[PDB]
Design a binder for this molecule. Sequence first.
Ligand SMILES: [Zn+2]
Lengths: 55, 73
Amino acid sequence: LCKKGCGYYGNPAWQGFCSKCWREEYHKARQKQIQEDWELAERLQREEEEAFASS
Amino acid sequence: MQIFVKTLTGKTITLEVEPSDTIENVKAKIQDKEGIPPDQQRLIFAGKQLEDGRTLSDYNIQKESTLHLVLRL
Ligand SMILES: [Zn+2]
């Protein structure tokens, strides 16, 4: 049984989730990683702007 | 396998790579496609700037993973 409790059977290759709850979890984790990476990139851009300005 | 490289302008670059590819070799592919010299490229994945002598597999970059790219001014 899917550890999210949707009533379907979980696949041990998918960490105990069924197919649908696994794909949701995969998409959400990538969305969060991609948003945090974008924030880091904007911080790096600001660091580039300061260094460039200082010369 | 395909990966995506997103810039701060909203542009996404698709690259054909293998997990054993070095970061330096991915920067060469970006230069070939976008003209950006490797030395001006800063790659990001999962909270880390990517180091030239490491591989895509070292960072858990997988099929359809999205990296970010910032350029040195
Ligand atoms: Zn489920």
